[PDB]
């Protein structure tokens with residue numbers, strides 16, 4: 001899965017591309033934590049969210 | 058007006074006092090299945106005075122975090138929203154509940170039902186409007202039923218349907234008055250015009266609008282919308298037929314109509330009922346439901362250059378070519394615990410090239 | 411059974427013949443523009459092997475003609491060729507063929523180009539293992555959701571008439587109906603006081619022995635569709651533990667997967683992230699418990715996201731060994747698990763059939779190449 005592929009931050013992931021693949025990668029990044037695979041949380045309104053591979057990687 | 062900040066307390070997959078915002082003109086959101094994304098729309102609908110009788114709740118006790126399993130996080134849970142617009146009124150609304158009792162708040166004060174109405178239609182939305190409130194499969198729902206129910210729902214939106222249950226009982230007995238009376242007849246066209254000038258006024262408006270709406274969705278000349286009334290003097294007594302001629306077809310009835318186009322017709326009808334007393338903000342979920350990628354780009358462009366005048370838009374989508382071009386990609390993500398919880402994080406596609 | 415190929419002539423959107431590559435062994439995909447004609451193919455199949463589109467008054471069946479680029483065609487042809495690799499057909503025929511011509515009034519049939527009429531084709535269809543009474547596995551558009559938003563009542567009727575005992579609850583309550591208002595007759599005679607009293611006992615005894623096998627026959631499929639449902643759902647979801655429960659009485663659907671904390675709720679009070687799973691799971695429960703000659707799916711991937719596609723495609727790629735599954739897709743993840751790929755285009759008011767290759771499927775429908 002492309003979500004598992006990214007195991008190999010996210011702004012640098014989604015920088016040099018159009019909204020298409022940038023947003024696809026961001027969406028998969030958000031999805032893969034559905035069962036706590038990474039750790040991430042945004043308390044501030046609008047800025048970066050940092051996550052690293054965790055329990056299932 | 059533009060919406061900025063939203064505060065939630067103790068709803069489905071919503072544990073914590075999270076404040077959410079700000080927002081923009083056309084904000085899109087995407088996430089995993091069952092990520093509480095539809096619960097955002099549930100909160101938006103509830104904070105604006107929902108019926109609270111059709112939201113998976115018995116009366117008020119199943120609308121709490123883990124409520125219909127027997128483990129509510131508390132007996133109280135509430136939303137507050139920040140509405141900012143012209144007139145320098147950056148006000149806030151709030152819907153709170155304790156036990157089986159509910160309470161309204163306008164800028165943190167006690168508010169009852171009819172006062173909420175007199176301040177709500179001030180915003181331009183009727184107590185029985187519910188016009189723009191979308192569902193996960195709303196665009197797959199309105200088309201299937203017979204036209205009579207569409208007539209009923211399109212007549213109840215103009216403060217008219219609340220007296221049909223007494224107008225219907227008028228006619229069949231007045232024949233006896235005809236058989237022998239005239240005072241009642243001379244007063245009987247009063248309710249007749251109370252129906253006509255109240256319903257047909259918006260009826261003709263939406264009938265005119267649907268044409269350019271379907272065009273803006275498709276820009277196909279042969280693709281034309283037609284809300285054909287039957288017996289226009291008493292149209293709501295029967296069904297009102299619809300004909301959404303696709304670009305490659307002709308005028309065809311609703312019987313042998315292809316399913317894959319009912320989504321576009323339903324969206325056009327949504328924007329048509331929008332044309333009648335529009336709401337300053339839009340909610341959309343699962344726009345890539347049954348509409349293939351062919352028309353998804355046209356639809357997405359139609360909204361994101363259609364909602365730049367007075368009303369903003371909130372949308373959920375899945376197909377790639379949509380978020381190839383949108384301007385905001387906010388997200389909500391789940392997390393485990395004693396039950397399901399969700400947390401809000403914000404990226405905007407405007408920064409994405 | 412084992413579908414080989416189809417031929418369509420002027421059915422709804424195909425004014426031309428449809429000689430293409432024969433359909434593959436296990437599963438194939440259909441891709442194309444919205445309104446291209448993919449669904450029309452499935453109504454063509456349903457029409458050629460079910461009467462639900464051929465039992466109405468002879469007005470709409472004329473609209474069941476093709477009216478795309480010209481006037482109404484007085485005659486249209488539909489036929490399906492199979493391959494009796496399993497000796498399913500009672501008649502010793504290597505290549506099973508069914509055919510119907512629709513006209514102004516003619517709707518007769520041809521088995522292997524043999525003249526056959528209405529009753530003498532349904533008799534063989536019933537000997538061929540098909541459920542006319544409830545059209546299983548020809549689930550049409552919007553099915554996965556129509557069973558979903560609605561209460562226990564329609565799921566009760568769905569299960570109980572895919573079993574199929576409609577006459578039974580049409581007459582059991584009618585027998586019950588007269589026993590209600592006639593209680594005064596007994597009591598008036600009871601006030602007067604004779605054989606009818608033991609007759610009332612006889613009524614209860616005969617009704618009970620009548621109901622003995624009816625509900626038993628339901629349990630002759632209820633427990634089967636229940637036990638595999640948990641098994642198939644556990645196969646779909648590594649934590650999956652969805653079950654059915656019994657209570658005339660109602661039933662209950664319940665779901666449990668990967669949560670283990672509080673996620674034991676009924677899907678009626680659940681959002682749309684599981685309704686399609688419950689649907690597909692019950693169809694696959696019928697799959698395993700009650701095998702069918704083939705399986706036909708429409709828009710079974712309308713609501714959920716690609717996470718569900720991964721698991722469902724992984725499961726289907728292995729379940730294909732049971733029988734042939736046919737569906738329509740718009741995304742490549744589940745398209746990648748098909749033996750062959752097929753597509754539908756639309757030119758000059760007429761559909762166009764063409765077997766699409768892998769190199770053409772995984773690029774045209776992924777990148778938006780729309781126009782108009």
Ligand SMILES: Nc1ncnc2c1ncn2[C@@H]1O[C@H](COP(=O)(O)OP(=O)(O)OP(=O)(O)O)[C@@H](O)[C@H]1O
Nearest residue numbers: 069070090091092093094095096679680681682683
């Ligand atoms: N019966 C219920 N009782 C309590 N909470 C519920 C119940 N049903 C659903 N929920 C809550 O609602 C959430 C549903 O998620 P969400 O709102 O994202 O779904 P959806 O958008 O309708 O689904 P889809 O992924 O098909 O678009 C669950 O995770 C849970 O927190």
Ligand SMILES: Nc1ncnc2c1ncn2[C@@H]1O[C@H](COP(=O)(O)OP(=O)(O)OP(=O)(O)O)[C@@H](O)[C@H]1O
Nearest residue numbers: 313315316317318443444445446447448449450477
């Ligand atoms: N009475 C009719 N006569 C001729 N063509 C018709 C008639 N009714 C519908 N059609 C055609 O059927 C087509 C439906 O094609 P299709 O099977 O692809 O359905 P869809 O659900 O709209 O599309 P998709 O499966 O791509 O999502 C329509 O585009 C229309 O041109």
